[PDB]
Green fluorescent protein
Amino acid sequence: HHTDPMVSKGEELFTGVVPILVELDGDVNGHKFSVSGEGEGDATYGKLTLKFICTTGKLPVPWPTLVTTLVLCFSRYPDHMKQHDFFKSAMPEGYVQERTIFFKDDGNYKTRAEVKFEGDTLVNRIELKGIDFKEDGNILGHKLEYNYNSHNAYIMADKQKNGIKSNFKIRHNIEDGSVQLADHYQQNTPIGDGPVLLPDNHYLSTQSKLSKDPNEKRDHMVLLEFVTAAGITL
């Protein structure tokens, strides 16, 4: 129950637990790979549970480097901030999420994703191109720890494109106790013609836990993610 019928329309699609399917076709320095993911999102708690399988064999990059690529419509927007939820307002027709991810002293990922409903299922369809990576480096050399760290990301409207932009840094732990920086540039634009909610400046707070399925022999990542919006007060 919200005063704004635009907010009601978005909230209605994300009542209860929504099934998620993730598809990624990837090419990093000519290593071609595919990832499939399945799980559930619960926007009420900002909670995602996903299991990803590399369907082409061994993943040629470390799993932690793909967490941000592999669905911000499951973010928990507090009641006083629901007018600022671009991600749900674009559904069900969906949104494009584009990134460039710069790995300091290494290569970059270029990603393009379509996030939309197919019936009751929320689908994230991604293409990833990776170029200029070092053979011996932390990424292609698999020197990252299998873990993730809490981070905040500031969201700004881009009035011109009727979308949003975000720039933010992820620090990946290297197995020697150093850090690999990953500089993220992000833009989102709606797929539909309809109006969307353009937000005031705010931030998303994210926690992620990575685990393994002890019965799974395929190369895989189990992901538990919480995302909460913050930074506008009552």
